[PDB]
Amino acid sequence: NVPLDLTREPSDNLREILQNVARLQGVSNMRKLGHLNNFTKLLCDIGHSEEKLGFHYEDIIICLRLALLNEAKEVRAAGLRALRYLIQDSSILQKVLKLKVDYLIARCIDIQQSNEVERTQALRLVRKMITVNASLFPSSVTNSLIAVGNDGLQERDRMVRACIAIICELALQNPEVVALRGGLNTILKNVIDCQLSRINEALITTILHLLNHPKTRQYVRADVELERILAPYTDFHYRHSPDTAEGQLKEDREARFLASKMGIIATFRSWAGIINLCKPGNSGIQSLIGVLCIPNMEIRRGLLEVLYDIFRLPLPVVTEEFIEALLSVDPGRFQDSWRLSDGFVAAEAKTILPHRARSRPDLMDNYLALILSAFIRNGLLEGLVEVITNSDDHISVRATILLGELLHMANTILPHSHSHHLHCLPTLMNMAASFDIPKEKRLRASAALNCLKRFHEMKKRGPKPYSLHLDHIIQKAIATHQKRDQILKDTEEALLINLRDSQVLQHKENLEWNWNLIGTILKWPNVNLRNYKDEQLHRFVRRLLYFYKPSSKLYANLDLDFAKAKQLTVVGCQFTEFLLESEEDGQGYLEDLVKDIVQWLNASSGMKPERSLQNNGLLTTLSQHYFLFIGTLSCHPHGVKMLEKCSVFQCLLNLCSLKNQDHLLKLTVSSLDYSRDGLARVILSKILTAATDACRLYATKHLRVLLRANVEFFNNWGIELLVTQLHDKNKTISSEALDILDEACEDKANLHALIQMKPALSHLGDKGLLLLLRFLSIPKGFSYLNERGYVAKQLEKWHREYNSKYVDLIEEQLNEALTTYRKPQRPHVYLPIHLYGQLVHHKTGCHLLEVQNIITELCRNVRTPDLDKWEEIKKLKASLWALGNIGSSNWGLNLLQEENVIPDILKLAKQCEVLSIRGTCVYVLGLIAKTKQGCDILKCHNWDAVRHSRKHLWPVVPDYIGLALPVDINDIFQVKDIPYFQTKSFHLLRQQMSLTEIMNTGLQEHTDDNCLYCVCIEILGFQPSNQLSMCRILLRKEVLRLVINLSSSVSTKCHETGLLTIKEKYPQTFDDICLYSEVSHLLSHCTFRLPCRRFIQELFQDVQFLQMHEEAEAVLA
Amino acid sequence: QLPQLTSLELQYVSPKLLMCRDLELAVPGTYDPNQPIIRIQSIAPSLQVITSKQRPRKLTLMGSNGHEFVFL
Amino acid sequence: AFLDNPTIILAHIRQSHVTSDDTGMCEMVLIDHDVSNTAQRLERLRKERQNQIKCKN
Ligand SMILES: Nc1ncnc2c1ncn2[C@@H]1O[C@H](COP(=O)(O)OP(=O)(O)OP(O)(O)=S)[C@@H](O)[C@H]1O
Ligand SMILES: [Zn+2]
């Protein structure tokens, strides 16, 4: 409007707020809002202080709360924004809160008067109010936010989620003011109509956080609040909203099912949900299993999706036959990431080949074992058997596959006492063998047991290579592993019969030949064109050569997804190795074939000026398989000689440098053989050092295919290539190579190879430091790092800082795994490397750790917990993880049993109050049981563990994987009960008297405080309120009893029409501010619905309030 | 959710009624001291609710002589 | 999982409500810098009451 900014601040701000008051006449709203902008700029550049502003805070509050009452939305938004910049400490907020400005803020929230910019500043102001001091938040804005978020979805309000977010932010710092007005019920009923997964889990996390700490656990009821979310499943006819559109009744039901499913699978990822849902009483998990045993084919088919998504198992296809849904849960099934464009061989080898770690704890197995034991304890297997027998076929197939997956998980991640009597299945075998029941139940039980045996055979088969490159890689690795440590003749007759029936020599028409017979002639042992010199065999191999050459354009033109596409490629590979099987007679065909191959590849790569572009022919036809021939030419020692007789390796070396085609480098890097030293490793090193960044990343990622497949002598060159890749310019390639090295150092022969070529892993992030800490696990390398002053430098660093950062690391990994947090299918949550775990291994750093006396303060911290704040809980988590990593070997239990701290952790795992550390203790006791002595110690305290490693799939019942579980799972589910925080005249006259006949103060709870006007007459010297025009006192109590009766929501129409007739007959009874303050105080203490609350707040809209304005202008000037 | 109620399963409503399978009680409404008594053998595990303002159920017991006794 | 300390829970709430809201409002409301139908009813009842009261009861 007219800013100067160079004057006396007292004169300026006095004319500023005087023009804000404006005497309710002769001042426009535009100059007032520009003045409010000038005021907030002046408060921005000059700091708020009562001496340099020239006025007390109170007058600024009185002349800023008048800006909320003007009819223009812009001046109201400007007043709210200027009030937000004033609240900076607790005293200003207390002075703002003493006179009832919160009534005006709660008024400006709930009007929805086409203002989405004016309601944003109010929410920002109350977020600032929660931020400054949340223990002084008023009940007015709390009731306003609860009324908006409780009945906002039906009224199409667009501020619903923005209000529920503020309610959830308020419930973390001041839970009593939210639980008193019923905000937790609003949160809990708002997770059942929210299809968005992240918002649903963010809403359920606050409810599960109040149930964690006892001081907040006193604000939640026992079995009626949290168990509401499994009410769409337990109640067959569930009606969430009382008044909804009857046209949408099925889509609403599916929305309730989806939101309740997301809430159920989001409470089972938190420890406060696992413990509170599996309590030993009449819990909420037994009501979930009990409704599964009831033949209702709508709830029963929907609970199986929840059971499939809890245990992280893949869903089968919806069919009626077991053999079709068994094929869809095959772990080696084709996926869209395995295509050549996205993830050709490396992403497939990640899935089908197993991880190199056989003794890492893998905390996902700990969590799944705890969940499976808690579900089996409440009788899930009997319910699954009852669903298998007495149901439809569509549900019986899905329940049979679920029972097969659970029975396979039982003999893998559960301890022996938990899982030695599960595979008998008494309730199903006694039904399959009883000839007294009707025969249908017996036969379907026998069919179910046959399908379970078939699923067990499918599980013990394993994943198979879908592709033909990875198949050749695994076959070559198995062949060299067999070859490192150590049939019929059919001379001329049967060979001639087989080549006669093969139909190759009869007619030259392709796709009509008998390719099984061709494969049998080419793969028979002693026919190799070197001992059987017959002209018919030469004709046969010449016809096959002319078919397989790309220049003839016969094999290179058939497209992908062909009927017989893999068979022709397999026959081609065994044919081009059969040609090499005669090394002195098989040159004239093999040289011609490889010359035609390199001619085609030079023509298609871009080494010619004709087109230099044939990516549309390689990517969709079988002509991309000509690398595989080079692959099966590259394994044999006589193969590399023949391959170098032609210009093949130099051709790939020139292919490495180009920039336009990235698929050809993917094809040649996954086909060649790197078993022996030669020119094949030079091409791999050239792709790894100087190529396109995407091809460089894929070549760095293709070392898992050479690591997990157990290619021999990997520690010689693969470690060298990884160390060379660590110095790359790109960051993702270096981080990926760091991850490959962190996986590869799980073998001692690879860690010894890495230590012998000392790298620089300190200039990278925390992953490089965690990889370098693995050097301490063996004496050769610990003794190397100890001389340069590194272990003593890391000891105090991990003592002061990195003990409480390791817990952040493992919690971040678990949250990224199974809570969908994403800090800015089942994964493998492998345990990070702890220095205390590496020092103990070799008995020298064990003594180096013992002389520092770090275990004593750790046991003192575990024995003396505070359990009140949130920093000491973090310190206790750090100490528990440190003790669990110390007790991971035999040299750690020796110095850990001298203080006797294992019973302390065992008692903390079942008698603690906070449940997050009660789960942390379970993980730590699992990590303790990685040795035989640890499991023997835990057995005396009635805690079983798994005694097998991850080496064999089926180990004979008599280093380990870290997993320990109590013998009775209900021991850690005991919670000591906390009582709820609640257990600790004219109304009779108006029934028989009408309003007109009684026509021929009324404020009940009105005092000096809690009034909009009467608070100021004492502190700031406001003049007392005037005498208004017994004629008005009765209308006051009449409108008060009407707005009281409007709270029950029984018959709202009569009361609103009565209020409308009162406003029509007497438009001046809604002008006294001492009545508006009373009805605002009544709104601040009752449960009004949102349209009723909006109507009540809008009744007092077109009011003047002249007297407070003029006396504020009088008290100012 | 009251017009939606049209059938009742005994596993969901009252699980002690369908697990009887034999009783010493007589079938209600039929007992005379000059005749051999009919004992309650079984109870059907599904009831059908009649669409009315009071919703009367349709219980059907099964006596020891192989005859069904339908009640309301 | 471990979502128990109030800082991670607050960060999860803010990023979940900001990123996954179709309607705008939240990314304006959750900025981390600070870290008339009754009028229609009354006018209708006014015009109805004007014509209504014309007889003796
Ligand atoms: N689709 C085909 N498949 C195999 N051979 C083909 C095909 N089309 C044409 N031919 C010809 O057949 C030749 C190979 O046949 P040979 O090994 O010479 O046996 P052959 O019976 O002596 O053949 P000809 O035609 O009688 S001399 C190929 O090099 C082409 O000349
Ligand atoms: Zn007053």
Curated annotation (Swiss-Prot), chain A:
One of its GO terms (molecular function) is ribosome binding. There is a cross-link at residue 250 (Glycyl lysine isopeptide (Lys-Gly) (interchain with G-Cter in ubiquitin)). It is found in: Cell membrane; Endoplasmic reticulum membrane; Lysosome membrane. Phosphorylated by MTOR; when part of mTORC2. One of its GO terms (cellular component) is plasma membrane. The keyword Metal-binding does not apply. Transmembrane segments: none annotated. SMART domains: RasGEF_N_2, RICTOR_M, RICTOR_N, RICTOR_phospho, RICTOR_V. Pfam families: RasGEF_N_2, RICTOR_M, RICTOR_N, RICTOR_phospho, RICTOR_V. Zn(2+) binds at residues 1006, 1011, 1014, 1074. Keywords: Acetylation, ATP-binding, Cell membrane, Developmental protein, Endoplasmic reticulum, Host-virus interaction, Isopeptide bond, Lysosome, Membrane, Nucleotide-binding, Phosphoprotein, Ubl conjugation, Zinc. Residues 1-756 are annotated as: Interaction with NBN. ATP binds at residues 510, 539, 543. Its main location: membrane. Residues 488-537 are annotated as: Ribosome-binding domain. The modification Phosphoserine is found at residues 11, 241. Belongs to the RICTOR family. Component of the mechanistic target of rapamycin complex 2 (mTORC2), consisting in two heterotretramers composed of MTOR, MLST8, RICTOR and MAPKAP1/SIN1. The mTORC2 core complex associates with PRR5/PROTOR1 and/or PRR5L/PROTOR2. Contrary to mTORC1, mTORC2 does not bind to and is not sensitive to FKBP12-rapamycin. Binds directly to MTOR and PRR5 within the TORC2 complex; interaction with MTOR is enhanced by deubiquitination of RICTOR by USP9X. Interaction with MAPKAP1 is not enhanced by RICTOR deubiquitination by USP9X. Interacts with CCDC28B. Interacts with NBN. Interacts with SIK3. This is Rapamycin-insensitive companion of mTOR. It comes from Homo sapiens (Human). The gene is RICTOR.
Swiss-Prot record, chain B:
Part of the mechanistic target of rapamycin complex 1 (mTORC1) which contains MTOR, MLST8 and RPTOR. The mTORC1 complex is a 1 Md obligate dimer of two stoichiometric heterotetramers with overall dimensions of 290 A x 210 A x 135 A. It has a rhomboid shape and a central cavity, the dimeric interfaces are formed by interlocking interactions between the two MTOR and the two RPTOR subunits. It is linked to Smith-Kingsmore syndrome: An autosomal dominant syndrome characterized by intellectual disability, macrocephaly, seizures, umbilical hernia, and facial dysmorphic features. Focal cortical dysplasia 2: A form of focal cortical dysplasia, a malformation of cortical development that results in medically refractory epilepsy in the pediatric population and in adults. FCORD2 is a severe form, with onset usually in childhood, characterized by disrupted cortical lamination and specific cytological abnormalities. It is classified in 2 subtypes: type IIA characterized by dysmorphic neurons and lack of balloon cells; type IIB with dysmorphic neurons and balloon cells. The kinase domain (PI3K/PI4K) is intrinsically active but has a highly restricted catalytic center. The FAT domain forms three discontinuous subdomains of alpha-helical TPR repeats plus a single subdomain of HEAT repeats. The four domains pack sequentially to form a C-shaped a-solenoid that clamps onto the kinase domain. The chain holds residues 2114 to 2185 of 2549 of the full protein. This is Serine/threonine-protein kinase mTOR. It comes from Homo sapiens (Human). ATP binds at residues 52, 54, 72. The modification Phosphoserine is found at residue 46. The gene is MTOR. Changing residue 46 to A: Reduced activity of the mTORC1 complex. Residues 49-55 are annotated as: G-loop. It is found in: Lysosome membrane; Endoplasmic reticulum membrane; Golgi apparatus membrane; Cell membrane. Belongs to the PI3/PI4-kinase family. The modification Phosphothreonine is found at residues 51, 60.
Curated annotation (Swiss-Prot), chain C:
Phosphorylated at Thr-38 by AKT1 or RPS6KB1 in the presence of growth factors; the effect of this phosphorylation is however unclear. According to two studies, phosphorylation at Thr-38 by AKT1 is part of a positive feedback loop that increases mTORC2 activation. It comes from the Eukaryota. Ubiquitously expressed, with highest levels in heart and skeletal muscle. It is found in: Cell membrane; Endoplasmic reticulum membrane; Early endosome membrane; Late endosome membrane. The modification Phosphothreonine is found at residue 38. Coiled coil: none annotated. The modification N-acetylalanine is found at residue 1. Belongs to the SIN1 family. Component of the mechanistic target of rapamycin complex 2 (mTORC2), consisting in two heterotretramers composed of MTOR, MLST8, RICTOR and MAPKAP1/SIN1. The mTORC2 core complex associates with PRR5/PROTOR1 and/or PRR5L/PROTOR2. Contrary to mTORC1, mTORC2 does not bind to and is not sensitive to FKBP12-rapamycin. Interacts with MAP3K2. Interacts with ATF2. Interacts with MAPK8. Interacts with GTP-bound HRAS and KRAS; inhibiting their activity. Interacts with IFNAR2. The CRIM domain forms a ubiquitin-like fold with a characteristic acidic loop, which recognizes and binds AGC protein kinase family members substrates. Component of the mechanistic target of rapamycin complex 2 (mTORC2), which transduces signals from growth factors to pathways involved in proliferation, cytoskeletal organization, lipogenesis and anabolic output. In response to growth factors, mTORC2 phosphorylates and activates AGC protein kinase family members, including AKT (AKT1, AKT2 and AKT3), PKC (PRKCA, PRKCB and PRKCE) and SGK1. In contrast to mTORC1, mTORC2 is nutrient-insensitive. This is Target of rapamycin complex 2 subunit MAPKAP1. It comes from Homo sapiens (Human). The chain holds residues 2 to 105 of 522 of the full protein.
